[PDB]
Design an enzyme around this catalytic site. Structure first.
Site, PDB file in Angstrom:
ATOM      1  CG  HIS D  14      38.135  25.077  41.127  1.00  0.00           C
ATOM      2  ND1 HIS D  14      37.534  25.433  42.322  1.00  0.00           N
ATOM      3  CD2 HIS D  14      37.567  23.888  40.778  1.00  0.00           C
ATOM      4  CE1 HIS D  14      36.628  24.525  42.656  1.00  0.00           C
ATOM      5  NE2 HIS D  14      36.616  23.580  41.730  1.00  0.00           N
ATOM      6  CB  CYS D  25      37.855  18.129  45.055  1.00  0.00           C
ATOM      7  SG  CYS D  25      36.047  18.139  44.813  1.00  0.00           S
ATOM      8  CG  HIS D  29      37.549  19.893  39.066  1.00  0.00           C
ATOM      9  ND1 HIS D  29      38.162  19.923  40.320  1.00  0.00           N
ATOM     10  CD2 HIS D  29      36.312  20.483  39.222  1.00  0.00           C
ATOM     11  CE1 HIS D  29      37.326  20.513  41.179  1.00  0.00           C
ATOM     12  NE2 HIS D  29      36.203  20.891  40.540  1.00  0.00           N
ATOM     13  CG  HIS D  31      32.749  23.346  38.931  1.00  0.00           C
ATOM     14  ND1 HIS D  31      32.256  22.077  39.088  1.00  0.00           N
ATOM     15  CD2 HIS D  31      33.782  23.478  39.796  1.00  0.00           C
ATOM     16  CE1 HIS D  31      32.957  21.458  40.025  1.00  0.00           C
ATOM     17  NE2 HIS D  31      33.885  22.291  40.459  1.00  0.00           N
ATOM     18  CG  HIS D  69      35.970  31.412  29.120  1.00  0.00           C
ATOM     19  ND1 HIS D  69      36.032  30.432  28.155  1.00  0.00           N
ATOM     20  CD2 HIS D  69      34.655  31.721  29.250  1.00  0.00           C
ATOM     21  CE1 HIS D  69      34.812  30.146  27.725  1.00  0.00           C
ATOM     22  NE2 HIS D  69      33.956  30.925  28.367  1.00  0.00           N
ATOM     23  CD  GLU D 108      32.495  24.278  43.717  1.00  0.00           C
ATOM     24  OE1 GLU D 108      33.240  24.791  44.593  1.00  0.00           O
ATOM     25  OE2 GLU D 108      32.629  23.091  43.323  1.00  0.00           O
TER      26      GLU D 108
HETATM   27 ZN   LIG Z   1      35.261  25.637  26.612  1.00  0.00          ZN
HETATM   28 ZN   LIG Z   2      35.431  21.856  41.968  1.00  0.00          ZN
END
Ligand SMILES: [Zn+2]
Ligand SMILES: [Zn+2]
Ligand SMILES: [Zn+2]
Ligand SMILES: [Zn+2]
Ligand SMILES: [Zn+2]
Ligand SMILES: [Zn+2]
Lengths: 117, 117, 117, 117, 117, 117
Positions: D14, D25, D29, D31, D69, D108
Site C-alpha cells: 500500500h 508512508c 511499501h 505490511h 497479496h 499493520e
Molecule cells: Zn512475498
Molecule cells: Zn503502511
C-alpha cells in the site's frame, strides 16, 4: 544428532559498569530475561527422552533462584553482566550438573540475544 | 564459542517476476520483513562485549534505510527479491562493514524464512 | 550455504505410556504442536528458490493430515509420542519425499522443543 | 454476554497518498496485516457455538481474497489505505454477511493497530 | 466509533517497598515493560487518521525517556511502582498532552498487566 | 477505574460431540489453551494493588489443576467443551472464589477465542 531445548524467563535488574559515562546501559535498569538451555545426546530407547525435564528443572533451579527477582551485579562472577558474560556464567553453573548441555542462550530484549557453546 | 544476534524489522513491497503467470507471488504485494544479523568472535575482556550494539545499528543504517518502506524490485540486486536472494544481498552489503558477521536470516512472514551464512 | 525453513501448527492429543504412575504426562492430554521443517541446498539462479513452497506444502500434506486434529498414539510409530520421537518420526515420513530436508523441529509448548537432524 | 474473535493475516502492498512529500508512508511499501473479526451474540444451547467458524471463514473469504497479496490502493474504497480507513472498509464488506460482527481490528505492524465498531 | 493503539517497551528496574518481609517483589528487580496507549476520536475525512503516529511518539517521548533504562522508584509519583500505579502515572503524564487518550495498559511480564481508565 | 488481567496456559485434550459426522473437531484432539482472568476494583491506597497476584493463583489453582494435562470431556459441565462453554464454565468455578472477576477469556489456538462476562 537430536537436541532438546527449554526456555525459562526471569525478571532482574542490572547495569554495565564498563560503558562510557553517558551511556544508557550504565544506569541501573532491568529486563525480562529469557534463557534457553540446549541439550544434546542419545534418545533413551524406553523413555524416548534424552533427559527427563523434571530433572532439567531440578538441576537448574539453584541457579535460577539466584537470578530471578534479583540484582545481577551482586552475584559473584556477574560483576559485568552483559549477555555474553551472563551466558558464559550460566554455562559455568549448569554444565557440571548437566553433562549433556550443549548450549546456553540469553536474551535481554526480544530483538537481541547471545548464544554460548 | 560466543555468538550474538540482533533482529530488525522493516515494511516493504515486493513481487516476484519469475513465477508462473497468475501465481499470487507475482502480484504487487508486501510483508513485514524481519532480518537477523548474527555476529561471532572474541568477547572483549574489559567491555564484556563482542561488539558495541551501537556500532552495528550504525553500520547497518544505510542498508536498512534502503529496505525500509521501499519497493524492493527497484533496488539494484533485488531484481528477484525472494527470501533467499534478499538474505544473500543483505550479507553482501553487510559483511564488508561488519567483519564478524556470521549469518543473515530473513523472514517474510512469521511462518517461514531463510538463513544465509 | 543457504537454508530455508517453514513452520506449521497442528492440534492434537497424546499421552506418554512409559512415565511412572502419578506423572501428568501419562494422562490424556493435548497441545498445539509446531513443526519446523528445514531445507538445505542450492539456490536456483532462475527462480531464486531452493524449493517452491508449493512443492513442500504438497509433499508434507499427507503427513500433516495424519497428525492434525488427531490422537497421536493411534498412529503406527507414534506409540510413545514425545518430542524426540515425534521429530524422528516426521523426518522419516518427509526425507523420502523432500530429499533436501536438513532438520525437523518439533515444539510441544512455547517453551520447549526438540530438533532432529 | 459472550464474544468470539478470529484473527487473520494477509500480506499486502500500500501507500498513503495524502502525507507530505518526504514522508516514508507516502512511498510504496507493504505490511503483513492482521485483522481480527469480533462477533457478539447468543450461544446455541445445542452446538455450544455463537457461530460455526467455517461459516465465518466462508463469509470473509471473498473480502480476504481481494486483500491478500494485493496492492491495496487498486481497491475501490481503499484509495487512502490507512488503518482507520481499512478497518471501516472491512466492516462495511463483512457486516452485511456476518450480522453478529461487533468489531473489526486491523494491525499493520506488530506494535500498532486500529479497532472499528 | 474508532480507536487507535500504539505499543512501547521500556527496560527498567523497580521494586515494591510495601510487600511482606521476604516477598520476592520487595527485592530490587526489573522487567521489560509494555505500555499501550489507546486513543479515541473522529477519523479526519481527508488524512484518514485519528492522530498522526509520530505526533504521538513525540508526545510520549519525555514520559518515555524518564521510564526507559531507569530505576522506577527514583521518579516522583512512583515510590511504589506496581502495575496499577505505573499505569495511572503514565495516564497522568500523558493525558494532558494527548487529549484523545482513553486508556493506558501497562504490562510487567508477558502474562500479566493492568489497564487504567 | 482499573482492571487487572492474568494469563495462564494449560495443555488439554477434547473433542466436540455435537458436530456433523465428518468434522475434524469431533475427533479426539487437543490444544495449548490460554485463559485470561480479568478483575476490576479499587486500587488499595497502601499496597497499590487491587488484589494480591498470589491470592489469585491460590483461588484459581483448584480449577486450573482440573483442566491442565486432562481431557476436558470427563469434567462435569464441560460435556460439550467449546471455547464459549469453557469460558462460561471457568467463570462459574472462579467467580465464587474471586468476586472481583469481570471477564474470562479462553483461546484454543493462537488465532481464535472467546470472552465471557
Ligand atoms: Zn512475498
Ligand atoms: Zn503502511
Ligand atoms: Zn541491560
Ligand atoms: Zn505432552
Ligand atoms: Zn516487578
Ligand atoms: Zn478443539
Amino acid at each position: 544428532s537430536t537436541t532438546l531445548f527449554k526456555d525459562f524467563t526471569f525478571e532482574a535488574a542490572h547495569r554495565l559498569p564498563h560503558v562510557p559515562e553517558g551511556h544508557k546501559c550504565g544506569r541501573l535498569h532491568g529486563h525480562s530475561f529469557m534463557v534457553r538451555l540446549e541439550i544434546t545426546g542419545e534418545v533413551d530407547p524406553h523413555t524416548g527422552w534424552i533427559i527427563d525435564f523434571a530433572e532439567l528443572k531440578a538441576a537448574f533451579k539453584p541457579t535460577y533462584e539466584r537470578l530471578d527477582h534479583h540484582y545481577l551485579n551482586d552475584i559473584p562472577g556477574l560483576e559485568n553482566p552483559t549477555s555474553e558474560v551472563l551466558a558464559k556464567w550460566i554455562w559455568d553453573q549448569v554444565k557440571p550438573v548437566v553433562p549433556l548441555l550443549s548450549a546456553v542462550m540469553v536474551k535481554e530484549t526480544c530483538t537481541a540475544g547471545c548464544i554460548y557453546r
